[PDB]
From Swiss-Prot, chain A:
The modification N6-acetyllysine is found at residues 430, 677. Changing residue 574 to A: Enhances Ran binding activity and does not abolish nuclear export complex formation. Enhances Ran binding activity and does not abolish nuclear export complex formation. Changing residue 280 to E: Does not abolish Rex-mediated mRNA export. Mediates the nuclear export of cellular proteins (cargos) bearing a leucine-rich nuclear export signal (NES) and of RNAs. In the nucleus, in association with RANBP3, binds cooperatively to the NES on its target protein and to the GTPase RAN in its active GTP-bound form (Ran-GTP). Docking of this complex to the nuclear pore complex (NPC) is mediated through binding to nucleoporins. (Microbial infection) Mediates the export of unspliced or incompletely spliced RNAs out of the nucleus from different viruses including HIV-1, HTLV-1 and influenza A. Interacts with, and mediates the nuclear export of HIV-1 Rev and HTLV-1 Rex proteins. Involved in HTLV-1 Rex multimerization. Residues 323-434 are annotated as: Interaction with Ran and nuclear export complex formation. It comes from Homo sapiens. Changing residue 545 to A: Abolishes Ran binding activity and nuclear export complex formation. Abolishes Ran binding activity and nuclear export complex formation. Does not abolish Ran binding activity and partially abolish nuclear export complex formation. This is Exportin-1. Disulfide bonds: none annotated.
Swiss-Prot record, chain B:
One of its GO terms (biological process) is snRNA import into nucleus. The keyword Cell inner membrane does not apply. This is GTP-binding nuclear protein Ran. It comes from Homo sapiens (Human). GO terms for molecular function: cadherin binding; chromatin binding; dynein intermediate chain binding; G protein activity; GDP binding; GTP binding; GTPase activity; importin-alpha family protein binding.
Curated annotation (Swiss-Prot), chain C:
One of its GO terms (molecular function) is nuclear import signal receptor activity. This is Snurportin-1. Belongs to the snurportin family. Residues 3-64 are annotated as: Necessary for interaction with KPNB1 and m3G-cap U1 and U5 snRNP import receptor activity. The chain holds residues 1 to 287 of 360 of the full protein. Functions as an U snRNP-specific nuclear import adapter. Involved in the trimethylguanosine (m3G)-cap-dependent nuclear import of U snRNPs. Binds specifically to the terminal m3G-cap U snRNAs.
Swiss-Prot record, chain D:
GO terms for cellular component: ATP-binding cassette (ABC) transporter complex; ATP-binding cassette (ABC) transporter complex, substrate-binding subunit-containing; maltose transport complex; membrane; outer membrane-bounded periplasmic space; periplasmic space. PROSITE patterns: SBP_BACTERIAL_1 (PS01037). This is Maltose/maltodextrin-binding periplasmic protein. Its main location: periplasm. One of its GO terms (molecular function) is carbohydrate transmembrane transporter activity. GO terms for biological process: carbohydrate transport; cell chemotaxis; detection of maltose stimulus; DNA damage response; maltodextrin transmembrane transport; maltose transport. CDD domains: PBP2_MBP. Disulfide bonds: none annotated. It holds the Pfam family SBP_bac_1. Induction: Induced by maltose and the transcriptional regulator MalT. Permanently repressed by cold shock in a PNPase-dependent fashion. Keywords: Periplasm, Signal, Sugar transport, Transport. Belongs to the bacterial solute-binding protein 1 family. It comes from Escherichia coli (strain K12). The complex is composed of two ATP-binding proteins (MalK), two transmembrane proteins (MalG and MalF) and a solute-binding protein (MalE).
Length: 1032, 172, 264, 395
């Protein structure tokens, strides 16, 4: 703890006698190699010490006498801190001292080739220190620096190498990472300085590249050139020998090929009209070099698979170069016949690279393939009189179709996930990298399919042939093929699609009969179903076939093989969603709609299915019932639909009426949970008309909820927290949650706020809300709050009147759980502020209708919300505050009183958040608020804040108030800084990104001690910008 | 002890600590109690070629609690940069973690993880994630909550360090 | 034409399990290549094979009870453990003297394994639907009392209606006949008291399913009499049939209304 | 202030007599309350803050409060455990931690004018009724257990809850005594004024002074003092209990108004060992049994109480109620009745904040934290490095 930490820190920082390097080395070595206690404390001590305002004073000694690299490095961290924050207030002779010690040490170390065996790591840290110094005083106090080092590079080769590293780092700090670390204007200034003095350095680099035989030096030079390519003027790139020098002297030699190719890729990324020929040159030469190191006769898939890290890196870098260049400049090479062979080679390369089994590389390639297919599609969207660009790519397009069909990713991603409770459910991932991959392959293949229907159907038919004759037969391969077949659904004309499908399912059925073994047959059947389910147009077109299919599904719902039941249900819910009407209406050759038949055979259909599969089934049928429009018929359908679960439900409710303690019976609670899950799924499908069922069980349901709640609560009271880990309480909480889910689920899809408000809302008040209030802290289900939010979001005006009593049950008691820290009871913080957001957004008059003393508590709850380190809570908090300000602006009666009451408190709390590093995520919101608020002060606030209203105008008062507040909060700030910031608040109150940047600037300024009269805040550029923004 | 040093970096509220803890205990932490400086947890996997130990340096991603920062990166053998697919900022901050990291560790295997892919409102789309490409980093969508692609980072790193691309994890 | 061909082919010959006259599909009176009218001889041949038992049942009950498998006309791993019937189509003429009938309640078929402290139920597919405490041997906490039962779970009555037994406290009954198993089961079941009652130690009531002879009078009787459950259908066992997991003609199946058109 | 909850039949007058000594030397007021059924109210009132600082009852209920986190863990210095006997400490022990201080061990009371001779068993007492008639408590399980555990009584092999009791032979025989005529204020009214043949009712035999005497299977209920964990007075309570109560004086001042019987304090128990009553009351513990301190006990107590009322004259029997009492042994109580929606919706219904006064009258009244305001000599170088530090560029 800070006991040992403080003690050791003080021992090291006493300053009354010689510093214990032995001890420091020991603490450091403990940190890098010690155990959790010893290491904890070492960590504590080192951080603690590093913080101290005078620790830097000892760094020189640390660098002078310490023998291990780690301690030196630590000392450098100590130094870096001072330079970063207190450099402008050190006694200047000390600054000079640090400058000399640092560049001197860098000379002595870098001018030793031992630097490698020496501490490369350590040297990087040194150079970084120098770059920090430069950042703090260049060129103002170091105007000859670039000349000095560029000149000193001609001295030694090692010195030059390290100098290249320094320049690179400086480039990174000035151009790449200046945002958030350097103020906007200072950043612009440094960028201008470097851009100005670049030609000198570029001459250095050109000299080194053209002449040096030193491999480390050359490499460092190239690595530096990479960043410079990130920012330098295009003349240096496209009007010098650079591109050539890279391709002829460096691209082919192994140890330089990667960096060289990366440089080339950066250059290739540039989109500029004037250097067409240079670009062509770039491509040609690059290609001619590539073919030497990666001949087109290479199995790039194997070459990657077996290959070492740099080989792999080179293949990836290659794919990047070709993809980049082709995407930005394909047109250039297209209109040059003399480049055909090269273009082809490039494409050929791509194809080879595509066969590589590595999803990242393949995504890189697929990016380009999708580009090409998209382009050719926009050129002309018609099949095989021929467009020019397409005619250029005709020799290889079918290879791309073949690639898409052959390597098609899985369409959906199913995942076995165990709930907050025990249950292992199947979770379908909705938006992931893999599904994105699939969607992109599908997109490309659809493009290419439109370009040629014949070629696509021919490819897939050949693949299927190859499945039948066993040449390419594998579960994986069959799956992939069918995934492709389904992926192009809708891309063909309906009659064509039918003609193609008939062939597909006929041959797949044949293959199913043909193969022997239940495994193979199961896989084939699964794929057949998948394809069928992906082609609903076909099913809708032909009723007899659809009926046949569905009957087959029902048949396979008994199949003992794993997967077949799952697939049967999954397919069934697809077909149900996409062909719902065909089950409600009477079809030709039928006396009754299919739904009646299904409902008449439900249990026989689902007797062998597991619970989750049954839910899927009920959901699927639920869609069919939703499809029936006649309210009466639909009501009867819903009634028969929910017969079986209602029987068990009724039995249990009866048992409970006779005796409540069966609600403590494990299997009973399980049954309840299952029944409720069925009701939820059903409700999702049917929608509003499900009310007839909901209303039927509603009050009973509420009762059981209550009971179980109470049960759970006591279980806490008796056995504390731990008791919430064993099966029973778990399954009970499950029942509560499914109850809430059912309620909010139906409310969300209810198209009558009146009825909901009068009927279904009042019982909740005592059944769930007052129960929530009644429960023990740990017993309270957070999912209550959230559900209420939903209801509010759905009702609004129809429930405003009820907002008070709701707040009686949940608000007060929930606060006390979440106002002692920011960590405990997270789901409650989340859901609570969700509810509060809902109320403020849809039922603001309720706030106008509640006592002031309580409104203070609400406002405080909001502030408290945006004070959170939890991202979503703070986010919602800021949103609420914004919409609340707007809401108040709407009601002109309360507006002035509200402003007069809370304006300054809000401002100061917000400012306390903005100046905090841990809240930067809400920057966009912060600005948006302050801007708005400050805008309001320009013309929309009639009353005056202080008694002397006349000497104290709104804007004036603000300016001096915010100024004094920030001055007292941050005493180390300068008057000019603060005044400039505060006028920046008014000047930019209609330019949000600018305001945001202004805030980032202030955030950087408050973290470093400028001190007295040191003015590198560039008031002219700043006040000019503020002026121009003020004009608009 | 055939063990490796893994450094885990990323913004605050990203999922680093929860991820490691779940890999340890098996539970899933609901609370956000920010890491201070660094917490190192030994974490073992059983491979077909014997056991392997990752000493995970769960570092703090809040600037306020940064601690020794890069100091923690010294002698690291591999790394996991992590961000939140529900917070675009955490992703835009990845190049910072990467620069600070690769300055101390010039040549180590690194995996970029998009965490919290279980949450529906995905802000950082898979389409937008490309930083690793030019940096030759390995990428994975993961979820410390629904356990999606839970062991892929450690598996890829293990393969890279050991040199056996066909290495696989086993029960015990 | 090609579409009629397709639909017809899909209905007729699209099968994974590939068993004849499967109850997974509706009655063949409405033709699959997996639809047959020649049950008779098949039954005889099947019974001929049972006679020379060349399979290891004891060990199998052991594997089921303690979940242990090893090595390479029998299944393993909790799936496909139940004896399933064909549709009753080719009625045997030695019916009334050699065929029993069981009236089957509406419910979900379940393999029941009581062992090591607990009882577990499985679908035909091997999915463990539930684990509960039961008075059945090996079903309570209170390591060698294992029991394997064939059941039909009725949700309404919350009752596992025991259709058949395959193991009771170590001793297997795959080796025995249907009639002897029915007697043995129907004797061991009522003589264990609370087993048929909702205790804390046993929440699910286990009840034996009454079986009857198939004399033209007895059939009118069983058709007439009431039952404590919604009748799903009728299962006509052969008296000597060993318990053989998977589909078989040695037990037939019929809907209640269909019986009126089967010699009575 | 320390607000004490204690039973009414005990010496709640003497505890105040000690509380005045505390009040004189401490300044803290000691209000010794006696509300409606403390053993039920104490665990419930802790839900909304209210409740006593320290509690007094037998150690059968403390087990329930202990796992909850209501009883403040006490760690008295080892010099204080020397004063009280080890087994009493074992009586209040729970999970290896002390939740309460052991105060006093809690016999046969009779009129010596009517029944001088002592029966060594219960079988030959009823027959002697017919003599006097011609010329104890009924509802609680506390008083009716002496014979229930005479023939055969949570068995200790630790108290396994799946092993509860025979209990029939002892209860039925007593019932037959109620049927042939061979509760609290009705029976005792006869004991006091000499109209019939624990130590919490010994001093009451004074104004009428019926000739008393203790003679020879009850409950050994160690009266204990538990500190509440929700109270701020955790340190001040143990001051009171160790230095003012468990002493020569304190326990004496409590014993003076109404005897405690056998007490845990060594120095004060050996003074009272000469006493016939206290020597014969610890004798009841020799053939008696030490009472469990677990959350599984309370259901048992209530069950024991119900089986006994209807056994005499009601709508239940003994074996019929023992078959149910057997099964009455996780959560003691939670919910009681299922149909309560209708009960609530037609009830009185109270009101709460956000539902009373006026909003558009005022907006402001008078009044990282919630509700708070926002929180926001020698130059460095010397040696080779500084020297070599002329600059990259030279002048
Ligand atoms: N939905 C979802 N939430 C997650 C997931 N992983 C973590 N979280 C939540 O996000 C928060 C992450 O907290 P930590 O893991 O401590 O954050 P950290 O990355 O260690 O942040 P620092 O300690 O500041 O470095 C926790 O509140 C988790 O509940 C996930 O996969 N899905
Ligand atoms: O170790 C199991 C093996 O089987 C599966 O793949 C094979 C299958 O074994 C073959 O019989 C044939 O059907 O080709 C399949 C191609 O998927 C598993 O998918 C595979 O991982 C595994 O090697
Ligand atoms: O997930 C799918 O769609 C494939 C179909 C056959 C088995 N798996
Ligand atoms: O699957 C079952 O258990 C019953 C048997 C006859 C048909 N359905
Ligand atoms: Mg952390």
């Amino acid at each position: 703890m800070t006991m040992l930490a403080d003690h050791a820190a003080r021992q090291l920082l006493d300053f009354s006698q010689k510093l214990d390097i032995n001890l420091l080395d020991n603490v450091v070595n403990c940190l890098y190699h010690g155990e959790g206690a010893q290491q904890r404390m070492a960590q504590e001590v080192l951080t603690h010490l590093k913080e101290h305002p005078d620790a830097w004073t000892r760094v020189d000694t640390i660098l002078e006498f310490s023998q291990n690299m780690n301690t030196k490095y630590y000392g450098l961290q100590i130094l870096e801190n001072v330079i970063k924050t207190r450099w402008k207030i050190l006694p200047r002779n000390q600054c000079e001292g640090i400058k000399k010690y640092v560049v001197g040490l860098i000379i002595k170390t870098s001018s030793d080739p031992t630097c490698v065996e020496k501490e490369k790591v350590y040297i990087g840290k040194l150079n970084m220190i120098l770059v920090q110094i430069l950042k703090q005083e260049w060129p103002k106090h170091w105007p000859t620096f670039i000349s000095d080092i560029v000149g000193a590079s001609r001295t030694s080769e090692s010195l030059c190498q390290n100098n290249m590293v320094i320049l690179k780092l400086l480039s990174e700090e000035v151009f790449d990472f200046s945002s958030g670390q350097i103020t906007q204007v200072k950043s612009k200034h440094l960028k201008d300085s470097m851009c100005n003095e670049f030609s000198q350095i570029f001459q250095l680099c050109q000299f080194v590249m053209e002449n040096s035989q030193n491999a480390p030096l050359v490499h460092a030079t190239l690595e530096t050139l990479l960043r410079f390519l990130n920012w330098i003027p295009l003349g240096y790139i496209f009007e010098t020998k650079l591109i050539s020098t890279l391709i002829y002297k460096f691209l082919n030699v192994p140890m330089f090929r990667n960096v060289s190719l990366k440089c080339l890729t950066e250059i290739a990324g540039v989109s500029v009209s004037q250097y067409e020929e240079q670009f062509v040159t770039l491509f040609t030469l690059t290609m001619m070099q590539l073919k030497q190191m990666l001949p087109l006769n290479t199995n790039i898939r194997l070459a990657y698979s077996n290959g070492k890290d740099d080989e792999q890196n080179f293949i990836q870098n290659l794919s990047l170069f070709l993809c980049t260049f082709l995407k930005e400049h394909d047109q250039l090479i297209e209109k040059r016949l003399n480049l055909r062979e090269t273009l082809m080679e490039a494409l050929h390369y791509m194809l080879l690279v595509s066969e590589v089994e590595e999803t990242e590389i393949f995504k890189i390639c697929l990016e380009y393939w999708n580009h090409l297919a998209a382009e050719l599609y926009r050129e002309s969207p018609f099949s095989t009189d021929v467009p020019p660009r397409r005619q250029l790519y005709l020799p290889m397009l079918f290879k791309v179709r073949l690639l898409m069909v052959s390597r098609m990713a899985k369409p959906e991603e199913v995942l076995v996930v165990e709930n907050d409770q025990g249950e292992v459910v199947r979770e379908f991932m909705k938006d992931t990298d893999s599904i994105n991959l699939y969607k992109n392959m599908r997109e490309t293949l659809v493009y290419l399919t439109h370009l040629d229907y014949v070629d696509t159907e021919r490819i897939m038919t050949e693949k299927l042939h190859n499945q039948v004759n066993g040449t390419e037969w594998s579960w994986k391969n069959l799956n992939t093929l069918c995934w492709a077949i389904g992926s192009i659904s809708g891309a063909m004309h309906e009659e064509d699609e039918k003609r193609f499908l008939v062939t597909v399912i006929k041959d797949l059925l044949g293959l199913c009969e043909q193969k022997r073994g239940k495994d193979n047959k199961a896989i084939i059947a699964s794929n057949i179903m998948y394809i069928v389910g992906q082609y609903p147009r076909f099913l809708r077109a032909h009723w007899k076939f659809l009926k046949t299919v569905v009957n087959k599904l029902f048949e396979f719902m008994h199949e003992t093989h794993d997967g077949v039941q799952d697939m049967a249900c999954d397919t069934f819910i697809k077909i149900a969603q996409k062909c719902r009407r065909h089950f409600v209406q009477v079809q030709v050759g039928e006396v009754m709609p299919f739904i009646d038949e299904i409902l008449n055979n439900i249990n026989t259909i689902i007797c062998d299915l597991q619970p989750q599969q049954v839910h899927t089934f009920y959901e699927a049928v639920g869609y069919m019932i939703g499809a029936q429009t006649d309210q009466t018929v639909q009501e009867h359908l819903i009634e028969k639909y929910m017969l079986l679960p209602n029987q068990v439900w009724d039995s249990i409710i009866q048992q409970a009426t006779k005796n409540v303690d069966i609600l403590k019976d494990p299997e009973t609670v399980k049954q309840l949970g299952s029944i409720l899950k069925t009701n939820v799924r059903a409700c999702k499908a049917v929608g509003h008309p499900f009310v007839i069922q909901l209303g039927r069980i509603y009050l009973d349901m509420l009762n059981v909820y209550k009971c179980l709640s109470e049960n759970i609560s006591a279980a806490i009271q008796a056995n504390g927290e731990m008791v919430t880990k064993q099966p029973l309480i778990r399954s009970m909480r499950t029942v509560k949650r499914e109850t809430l889910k059912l309620i909010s689920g139906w409310v969300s899809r209810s198209n009558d706020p009146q009825m909901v408000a009068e009927n279904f809302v009042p019982p909740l008040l005592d059944a769930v809300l007052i129960d929530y209030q009644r429960n023990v802290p740990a017993a309270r289900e957070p999912e209550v709050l959230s559900t209420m939010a939903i209801i509010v979001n759905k009702l609004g005006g129809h429930i405003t009147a009820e907002i008070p009593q709701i707040f009686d049950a949940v608000f007060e008691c929930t606060l006390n759980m979440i106002n002692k820290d920011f960590e405990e009871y997270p789901e409650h913080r989340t859901n609570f502020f969700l509810l509060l957001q809902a109320v403020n957004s849809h039922c603001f008059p309720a706030f106008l209708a509640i006592p002031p003393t309580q409104f203070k508590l609400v406002l405080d709850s909001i502030i408290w919300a945006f004070k959170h380190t939890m991202r979503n809570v703070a986010d919602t908090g800021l949103q609420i505050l914004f919409t609340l300000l707007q809401n108040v602006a709407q009601e002109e009666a309360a507006a002035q009183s509200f402003y007069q009451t809370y304006f300054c408190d809000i401002l100061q709390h917000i400012f306390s958040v903005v100046t905090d590093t841990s809240h930067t995520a809400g920057l966009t919101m912060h600005a948006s608020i302050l801007a708005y608020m400050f805008n309001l002060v320009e013309e929309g606030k009639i009353s005056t804040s202080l008694n002397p209203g006349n000497p104290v105008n709104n804007q004036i008062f603000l300016q001096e108030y915010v100024a004094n507040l920030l001055k007292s909060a941050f005493p180390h700030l300068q008057d000019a800084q603060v005044k400039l910031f505060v006028t920046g608040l008014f000047s930019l109150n209609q330019d949000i990104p600018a305001f945001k940047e202004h805030l980032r600037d202030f955030l950087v300024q408050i973290k470093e001690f400028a001190g007295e009269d040191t003015s590198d805040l560039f008031l002219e550029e700043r006040e000019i910008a503020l002026r121009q923004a003020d004009e608009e | 002890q055939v063990q490796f040093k893994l450094v885990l970096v990323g913004d605050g509220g990203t999922g680093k600590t929860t991820f490691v803890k779940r890999h340890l205990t098996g539970e899933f932490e609901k609370k956000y109690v920010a890491t201070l400086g660094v917490e190192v947890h030994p974490l073992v996997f059983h491979t077909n070629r014997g056991p392997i130990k990752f000493n995970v340096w769960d570092t703090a991603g809040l600037e306020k609690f940064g601690g020794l920062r890069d100091g923690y990166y010294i002698q690291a053998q591999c790394a996991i940069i992590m961000f939140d697919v529900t917070s675009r900022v955490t992703y835009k901050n990845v190049p910072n973690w990467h620069r600070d990291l690769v300055r101390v560790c010039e040549n180590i295997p690194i995996v970029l993880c998009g965490n919290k892919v279980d949450i529906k409102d995905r802000k950082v789309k898979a389409k937008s994630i490309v930083f690793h490409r030019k940096k030759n980093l390995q990428y994975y969508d993961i979820s410390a909550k629904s356990n999606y692609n839970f062991e892929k980072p450690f598996l890829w790193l293990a393969r890279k360090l050991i040199g056996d691309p066909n290495l696989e994890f086993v029960a015990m | 034409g090609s579409m009629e061909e397709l639909s017809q082919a899909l209905a007729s010959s699209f099968s994974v399990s590939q068993d004849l006259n499967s109850t997974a599909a509706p009655h063949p009176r409405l033709k699959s290549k997996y639809s047959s009218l020649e049950q008779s001889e098949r039954r005889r041949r099947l019974l001929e094979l049972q006679k020379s038992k060349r399979l290891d049942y004891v060990n199998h009950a052991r594997r089921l009870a303690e979940d242990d498998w090893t090595g390479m006309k029998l299944p393993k791993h909790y799936a496909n453990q139940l004896m399933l019937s064909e549709w009753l189509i080719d009625v045997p003429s030695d019916l009334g003297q050699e065929w029993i009938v069981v009236v089957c309640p509406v419910g979900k078929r379940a393999l029941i394994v009581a062992s090591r402290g607990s009882t577990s139920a499985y679908t035909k597919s091997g999915y463990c639907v539930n684990r509960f405490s039961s008075l059945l041997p090996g079903g309570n906490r209170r390591a060698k009392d294992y029991t394997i039962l064939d059941c039909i779970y009725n949700e309404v009555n919350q009752t596992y209606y025991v259709l058949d037994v395959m193991c009771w406290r170590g001793h297997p009954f795959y080796d025995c006949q249907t009639d002897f198993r029915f007697y043995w089961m129907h004797s061991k079941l009522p003589e264990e008291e609370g087993l048929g009652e909702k205790t804390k130690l046993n929440p699910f009531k286990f009840v034996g399913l009454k079986n009857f002879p198939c004399t033209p009078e007895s059939l009118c009787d069983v058709l007439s009499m009431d039952f404590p459950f919604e009748v799903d259908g009728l299962l006509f066992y052969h008296k000597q049939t060993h318990y053989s997991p998977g589909s078989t003609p040695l037990v037939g199946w019929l809907r209640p209304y269909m019986v009126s058109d089967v010699l009575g | 202030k320390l607000v004490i909850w204690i039973n009414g039949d005990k010496g709640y007058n003497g505890l105040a007599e000690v509380g005045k000594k505390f009040e004189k030397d401490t300044g803290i007021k000691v209000t010794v309350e006696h509300p409606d059924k403390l053993e039920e109210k104490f665990p419930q009132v802790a839900a909304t803050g209210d409740g006593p600082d320290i509690i007094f009852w037998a150690h059968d209920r403390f087990g329930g409060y202990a796992q909850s986190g209501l009883l403040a863990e006490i760690t008295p210095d080892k010099a204080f455990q020397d004063k009280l006997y080890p087994f009493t400490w074992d009586a209040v022990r729970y999970n290896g931690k002390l939740i309460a201080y052991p105060i006093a061990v809690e016999s046969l009371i009779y009129n010596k004018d009517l029944l001088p001779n002592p029966p060594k068993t219960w079988e030959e007492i009823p027959a002697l009724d017919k003599e006097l008639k011609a010329k104890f408590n009924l509802q609680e399980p506390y008083f009716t257990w002496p014979l229930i555990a005479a023939d055969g009584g949570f068995k200790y092999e630790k108290y396994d809850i799946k092993d509860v009791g025979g209990a029939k032979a002892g209860l039925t025989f007593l019932v037959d005594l109620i049927k042939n005529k061979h509760d609290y204020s009705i029976a005792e009214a006869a004991f006091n004024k000499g109209e019939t043949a624990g130590p919490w009712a010994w001093s009451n035999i004074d104004t009428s002074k019926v000739n008393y005497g203790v003679t020879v299977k009850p409950f050994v209920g160690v009266l204990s003092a538990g500190i509440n964990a929700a109270s701020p007075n955790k340190e001040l309570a143990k001051e009171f209990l160790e230095n003012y109560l468990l002493t020569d004086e304190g326990l004496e001042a409590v014993n003076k108004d109404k005897p405690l019987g056998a007490v845990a304090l060594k120095s004060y128990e050996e003074e009272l060992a000469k006493d016939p009553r206290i020597a014969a009351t610890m004798e009841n513990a020799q053939k008696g049994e030490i009472m469990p301190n677990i959350p599984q006990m309370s259901a048992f107590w209530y069950a024991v109480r119900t089986a006994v009322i209807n056994a005499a004259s009601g709508r239940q029997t003994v074996d019929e109620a023992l078959a149910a009492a057997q099964t009455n042994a996780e959560f003691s109580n939670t919910s009681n009745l299922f149909g309560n929606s209708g009960a609530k919706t037609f009830g009185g219904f109270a009101s709460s904040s956000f539902g009373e006064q006026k909003p558009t009258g005022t907006f402001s009244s008078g009044g990282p934290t919630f509700g708070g305001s926002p929180g926001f000599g020698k130059v460095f170088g010397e040696g080779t490095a500084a020297a070599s530090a002329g600059g990259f560029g030279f002048g």
